[PDB]
Design a protein around this ligand. Structure first.
Ligand SMILES: O=S(=O)(c1ccccc1)N(CC(F)(F)F)c1ccc(C(O)(C(F)(F)F)C(F)(F)F)cc1
Length: 221
């Protein structure tokens, strides 16, 4: 019914609030805390290897919270061990990317990274301009939509629970789950007068195309 769906919305948003890693109020009030021209040089002078192993640490950490988010998600636990791993190893990464836009400031084109805010010149040492630019451009486009926490909660759930991932065994059951989440998302945008964000959402395939490029560069190192 309908009450079930309102419950599902509430259920999903609680799970995100508990597992958002960084509170929005902390990220917003620290927007004035910017790296000095000296501190950026410090990061710029580091080696690829140090810089890669730092970023890979923050990512793994972020993925832990995404995993904890998936576990609190209604229906996910009921799935088999195979489909759980299929959905996670495909989408955990994609969720992390979506989550990142909260840490992005469009006013000065900076991102929160290890305590302070800094532009993309901070990652010079990684040696991959195009990849970093992708991340910033993607976050910038998502930041203009002013995603609420609940919108992020519901959207990331749908990113993660997708019945189009190859190698699913219990496909029919993942469809059912996705379904209810789609409805929950649409219901809530209606309740909040935010139906507008749908047409402004990233096209399906974009998220996946980004991740696939990021994972390939990463596996090198
Ligand atoms: O905090 S991060 O290191 C970060 C990287 C770049 C810009 C801002 C923040 N981290 C973001 C996270 F949400 F995971 F904390 C992050 C680390 C590494 C990446 C990479 O995409 C990849 F491929 F290594 F996973 C890349 F290193 F390529 F940038 C992406 C994001």
């Amino acid at each position: 019914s309908l009450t079930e769906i309102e419950h599902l919305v509430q259920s999903v948003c609680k799970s995100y609030r508990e597992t958002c890693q960084l509170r929005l109020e902390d990220l917003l009030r620290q927007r004035s805390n910017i790296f000095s021209r000296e501190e950026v040089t410090g990061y710029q002078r580091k080696s690829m290897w140090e810089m890669w192993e730092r970023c890979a640490h923050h990512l793994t950490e972020a993925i832990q919270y995404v995993v904890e988010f998936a576990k609190r998600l209604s229906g996910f636990m009921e799935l088999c061990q195979n489909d759980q791993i299929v959905l996670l190893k495909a989408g955990a990464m994609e969720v992390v990317l979506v989550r990142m836009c909260r840490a992005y400031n469009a006013d000065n084109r900076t991102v929160f990274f290890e305590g302070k805010y800094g532009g993309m010149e901070l990652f010079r040492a990684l040696g991959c301009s195009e990849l970093i630019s992708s991340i910033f451009d993607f976050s910038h486009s998502l930041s203009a939509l002013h995603f609420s926490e609940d919108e992020i909660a519901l959207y990331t759930a749908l990113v993660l629970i997708n019945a189009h991932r190859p190698g699913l065994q219990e496909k029919r059951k993942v469809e059912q789950l996705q379904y209810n989440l789609e409805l929950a998302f649409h219901h809530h945008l209606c309740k909040t007068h935010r139906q507008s964000i749908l047409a402004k959402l990233p096209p399906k395939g974009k998220l996946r195309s980004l991740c696939s490029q990021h994972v390939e560069r990463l596996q090198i190192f």
